[PDB]
């Protein structure tokens, strides 16, 4: 159902909350009364509507079939290229992933997308990442790899990855420090 | 001077002594004997007794009138037949 503001805009008038509730209850009674199309269109006048796009497969000079995508996390931006056929090799900035990511947590984060759809060792990945720290770069590469791999898994697997959070871009970024307080939220020591 | 075990006597039924005691207590309450027993512990002065009796009569009349009014108006409490108008 449209909100009270939408109803007021439609009727170019001002209505109270109780009037809106009365009208909504009347509309619900109309819907539950096995109303025909002549009334279903009337209902749809007051109805308001509430999937991830996938990049297409491309081809390179070498003849391999691949997809390319990108992602970001905090202040790090990464671009990933995933080939349809590979051997699990991932090279970040021209460096092998186990050398560019000595931390095991980052390597686990990189493994997470392919492991979720059960495709470890079935692809080859080349990533270019810039900015942020080790974990931000790992997260950006993870998001880019998942977005690119969406071009090779089935739609059901795409929906499963979306439900697993592999495709949502993490909006959590550093909050700015404000004047009069130590940090983003840390106030100064309240004297007495 | 009266015969014993006739007044305020309740026979127990299949040994439910608790139930028999509750029945006897209810009988005493309904007959007002408990009220008299507890109010005769201390002397209630006649003016206080008259005030209490008048207040009790007024409260009973008011409660009966309120209950009758609520019962009479309860019929209107049905579902709204003219919803939207």
Swiss-Prot record, chain A:
In Swiss-Prot or TrEMBL terms, this protein is called Small ribosomal subunit protein uS9m
Subunit (UniProt): Component of the mitochondrial small ribosomal subunit (mt-SSU). Mature mammalian 55S mitochondrial ribosomes consist of a small (28S) and a large (39S) subunit. The 28S small subunit contains a 12S ribosomal RNA (12S mt-rRNA) and 30 different proteins. The 39S large subunit contains a 16S rRNA (16S mt-rRNA), a copy of mitochondrial valine transfer RNA (mt-tRNA(Val)), which plays an integral structural role, and 52 different proteins.
Region called Disordered, residue ranges? 171-192
Localization, UniProt: Mitochondrion
Residues that the record marks as modified (N6-acetyllysine) are: 84
Give the family from UniProt: Belongs to the universal ribosomal protein uS9 family.
Organism lineage: Eukaryota, Metazoa, Chordata, Craniata, Vertebrata
Curated annotation (Swiss-Prot), chain B:
Q: What is its main location?
A: mitochondrion
Q: Provide a GO biological process annotation.
A: mitochondrial translation
GO cellular component terms, alphabetically, are: mitochondrial inner membrane; mitochondrial small ribosomal subunit; mitochondrion
Q: Which UniProt keywords apply?
A: Mitochondrion, Ribonucleoprotein, Ribosomal protein
- GO MF term list: RNA binding; structural constituent of ribosome
The cellular location(s) given in this protein's UniProt record come to: Mitochondrion
Do the record's keywords include Mitochondrion? yes
Q: Which InterPro entries match?
A: Ribosomal_bS21 (IPR001911), Ribosomal_bS21_sf (IPR038380)
Q: Which family does it belong to?
A: Belongs to the bacterial ribosomal protein bS21 family.
- Quaternary assembly: Component of the mitochondrial small ribosomal subunit (mt-SSU). Mature mammalian 55S mitochondrial ribosomes consist of a small (28S) and a large (39S) subunit. The 28S small subunit contains a 12S ribosomal RNA (12S mt-rRNA) and 30 different proteins. The 39S large subunit contains a 16S rRNA (16S mt-rRNA), a copy of mitochondrial valine transfer RNA (mt-tRNA(Val)), which plays an integral structural role, and 52 different proteins.
Q: Which NCBIfam families match?
A: S21p
Query: What protein name is recorded for this chain?
Result: Small ribosomal subunit protein bS21m
Provenance organism: Homo sapiens
**What gene does this protein come from?**
MRPS21
């Amino acid at each position: 159902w449209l909100i009270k503001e939408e109803l007021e805009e439609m009727l170019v008038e001002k209505l109270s909350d109780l009037d809106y509730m009365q009208f909504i209850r009347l509309l619900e009674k109309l819907l539950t009364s096995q109303c025909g199309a002549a009334e279903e269109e009337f209902v749809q006048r007051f109805r308001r509507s509430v999937k991830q796009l996938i990049e297409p497969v491309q081809y390179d000079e070498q003849g391999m079939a691949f997809s390319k995508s990108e992602g970001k996390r905090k202040t790090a931006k990464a671009e990933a290229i995933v080939y349809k056929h590979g051997s699990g090799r991932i090279k970040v900035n021209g460096i092998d992933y186990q050398l560019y990511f000595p931390i095991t947590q980052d390597r686990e984060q990189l493994m997470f997308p392919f492991h979720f759809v059960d495709r470890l060792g079935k692809h080859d990945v080349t990533c270019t990442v810039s900015g942020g720290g080790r974990s931000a770069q790992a997260g950006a590469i993870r998001l880019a790899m998942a977005k690119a791999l969406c071009s090779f898994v089935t739609e059901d697997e795409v929906e499963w990855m979306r439900q697993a959070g592999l495709l949502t871009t993490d909006p959590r970024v550093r909050e700015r420090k404000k004047p009069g307080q130590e940090g983003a939220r840390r106030k100064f020591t309240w004297k007495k | 001077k009266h015969l014993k075990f006739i007044a305020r006597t309740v026979m127990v039924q299949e040994g439910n002594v608790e139930s028999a005691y509750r029945t006897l207590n209810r009988i005493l309450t309904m007959d007002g004997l408990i009220e008299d027993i507890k109010h005769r512990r201390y002397y209630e002065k006649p003016c206080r007794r008259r005030q209490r009796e008048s207040y009790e009569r007024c409260r009973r009349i008011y409660n009966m009138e309120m209950a009758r009014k609520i019962n009479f108006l309860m019929r209107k409490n049905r579902a709204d037949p003219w919803q939207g108008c």
